[PDB]
């Protein structure tokens, strides 16, 4: 479909803003926060027909989500948590919505330049993580 293909390949973390204090609105307990806080993730985006895969490789924890946009799927996030989750693209933009004990969060990814921003947003609490190509 050409779905995501600015989207696709293999990313690395290389800036993180406020993620912490993201973390802890979340509900990230200390000694989770402080080892993943730490990691510089690789993450691998692809597309296989309707299928979008993303995963993530660390030294904390490697984590893979495969979706169908606008199609609810169940997600372990890397701090544990069990969600519900649904991914869309909106006006060009990645949200996925993480939905989990009358709670949620939302991540934005987007293209920006030759970087993939992500933006994780939970209540009044903004993160920006800058990924560039690995
Ligand atoms: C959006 C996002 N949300 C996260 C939420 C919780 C945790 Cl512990 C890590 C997260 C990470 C980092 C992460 C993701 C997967 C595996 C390891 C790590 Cl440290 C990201 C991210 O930068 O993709």
Not at 93 to 98: A, F, Y
Not at 100 to 112: F, H, L, N, Q
Request: proline share 1%; with cysteine.
């Amino acid at each position: 479909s050409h779905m995501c293909d600015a989207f696709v390949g293999t990313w690395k973390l290389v800036s993180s803003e406020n993620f912490d204090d993201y973390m802890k609105e979340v509900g990230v307990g200390f000694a989770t926060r402080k080892v993943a806080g730490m990691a510089k993730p690789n993450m691998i985006i692809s597309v296989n027909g309707d299928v979008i895969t993303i995963k993530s490789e660390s030294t904390f924890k490697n984590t893979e989500i495969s979706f169908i946009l606008g199609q609810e799927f169940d997600e372990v996030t890397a701090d544990d948590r069990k969600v519900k989750s649904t991914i869309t693209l909106d006006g060009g933009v990645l949200v996925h919505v993480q939905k989990w004990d009358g709670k949620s969060t939302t991540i934005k990814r987007k293209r920006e330049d030759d970087k993939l921003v992500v933006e994780c947003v939970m209540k009044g609490v903004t993160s920006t993580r800058v990924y560039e190509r690995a």
